[PDB]
Design an enzyme around this catalytic site. Sequence first.
Site, short mmCIF file in Angstrom:
data_model
loop_
_atom_site.label_atom_id
_atom_site.label_comp_id
_atom_site.label_asym_id
_atom_site.label_seq_id
_atom_site.Cartn_x
_atom_site.Cartn_y
_atom_site.Cartn_z
N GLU A 248 -1.98 37.50 -8.75
CA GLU A 248 -0.73 35.99 -8.17
C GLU A 248 -0.68 36.63 -6.46
O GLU A 248 -0.01 37.50 -6.72
CB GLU A 248 0.19 35.86 -9.18
CG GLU A 248 1.01 36.70 -9.94
CD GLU A 248 1.68 35.87 -10.87
OE1 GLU A 248 1.14 35.71 -11.47
OE2 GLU A 248 3.50 35.87 -10.89
N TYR B 35 -1.36 24.97 -14.39
CA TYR B 35 0.09 24.49 -13.78
C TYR B 35 0.59 23.32 -13.72
O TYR B 35 1.57 22.10 -13.56
CB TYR B 35 0.68 25.41 -12.99
CG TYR B 35 1.35 26.75 -13.03
CD1 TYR B 35 2.34 27.06 -13.73
CD2 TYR B 35 0.47 27.44 -12.79
CE1 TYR B 35 2.92 28.11 -14.06
CE2 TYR B 35 0.89 28.95 -13.18
CZ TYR B 35 2.16 29.03 -13.50
OH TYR B 35 2.28 29.91 -14.18
N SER C 207 -3.81 28.42 -11.60
CA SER C 207 -3.32 27.25 -10.81
C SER C 207 -3.25 25.72 -11.86
O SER C 207 -2.53 25.21 -12.14
CB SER C 207 -3.84 27.32 -9.22
OG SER C 207 -3.14 28.46 -9.11
N1 LIG Z 1 1.30 26.62 -9.52
C1 LIG Z 1 0.48 27.92 -9.45
O1 LIG Z 1 -0.13 27.09 -9.25
C2 LIG Z 1 0.88 29.07 -10.00
C3 LIG Z 1 -0.11 29.95 -9.24
C4 LIG Z 1 -0.30 31.41 -10.06
F1 LIG Z 1 -0.93 32.05 -9.91
C5 LIG Z 1 1.35 32.14 -10.30
C6 LIG Z 1 2.17 30.82 -10.68
N2 LIG Z 1 3.30 31.50 -11.10
C7 LIG Z 1 3.91 29.64 -10.99
C8 LIG Z 1 5.40 29.55 -11.80
C9 LIG Z 1 5.95 28.34 -11.46
C10 LIG Z 1 7.23 28.97 -11.94
C11 LIG Z 1 7.65 30.30 -11.54
O2 LIG Z 1 6.09 30.53 -11.55
C12 LIG Z 1 8.74 30.26 -12.73
N3 LIG Z 1 9.72 29.50 -13.10
C13 LIG Z 1 9.71 29.02 -12.53
C14 LIG Z 1 8.56 27.99 -12.51
N4 LIG Z 1 2.83 29.07 -10.79
C15 LIG Z 1 2.23 29.89 -9.93
#
Ligand SMILES: NC(=O)c1cc(F)cc2[nH]c(-c3cc4c(o3)CNCC4)nc12
Length: 346
Positions: free
Chosen positions: A324, A243, A240
Amino acid sequence: KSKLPKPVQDLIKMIFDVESMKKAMVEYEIDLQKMPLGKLSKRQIQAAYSILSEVQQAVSQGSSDSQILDLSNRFYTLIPHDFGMKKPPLLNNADSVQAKAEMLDNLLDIEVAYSLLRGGSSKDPIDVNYEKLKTDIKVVDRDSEEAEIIRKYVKNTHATTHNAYDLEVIDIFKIEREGECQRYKPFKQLHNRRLLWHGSRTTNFAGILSQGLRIAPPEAPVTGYMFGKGIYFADMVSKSANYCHTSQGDPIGLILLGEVALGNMYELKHASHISKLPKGKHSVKGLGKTTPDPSANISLDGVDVPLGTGISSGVNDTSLLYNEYIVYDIAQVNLKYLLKLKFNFK
Ligand SMILES: NC(=O)c1cc(F)cc2[nH]c(-c3cc4c(o3)CNCC4)nc12
């Protein structure tokens, strides 16, 4: 003369930082002369999503390059860019469409933050903007057992593959978004409630806090989601934290701990394109090759906290290194903590 603890004030300052908003637009190579921060429009952005959807459907249709170039130019007319020496990339492929869509999502939350900051005169500075977040924010005493569990979660679930940085908890905040308790109430009766990570860019947190974690709108392209349009979580903090898009220039990031009512998890090892869920399933769990050690899971106020070290899961034939979790109803999330993290890069 503000009454909030300094860490809360520092949080309010970082999330309502107008310089950071403009810097993020500059990084996206937006032309700020032609589209200033103050002119960002939810309607223009919504129309930009729709054009990206037409582009996406025309790559897959195999449409003429003239039809595709024209659609790609309409998008650049809606959201003007300034690329200097290179040309604006033709939007003719999944990876170009997804990049502009992820950028539009970021742009929308920036519009939420700036229009909040510029919205409706004798209270302290940090305190009037704090009220706009409609979120109760309290600092968690570092000496608490609450803090101790959270630091073990962060310490133990850093992935081996994410070697680019170390993490240090600077502040732990407990947050209560207005109305989220009531909105979350029906799903507390779902089984399998888990405390999970969700990272995002700092310029997103005014929108995240005032509106909660949201799902991409239907106007947005269906391309680019491993498990469709939902809210995504990790049980490994670094998955996470990637991101947050933090850098050496700004090495401070914000990450959420959300209680997610997973219920019966639809377990998948590869990309599946239902945003719809089977009857009796309430979430998707993407199975990684590495999962936190199940023996070290603890239950805290009826919520599982998987703070164990990453161990092999025995799951072979998966596209995912790490787990996830995805839910498709925003009401299945109750945000619990907001962490200010320091990234100490290689
Ligand atoms: N944010 C997170 O903490 C996060 C944690 C995970 F384990 C998997 C994730 N996947 C995504 C994500 C964001 C977007 C997409 O997938 C597809 N395209 C548009 C934006 N975020 C996470």
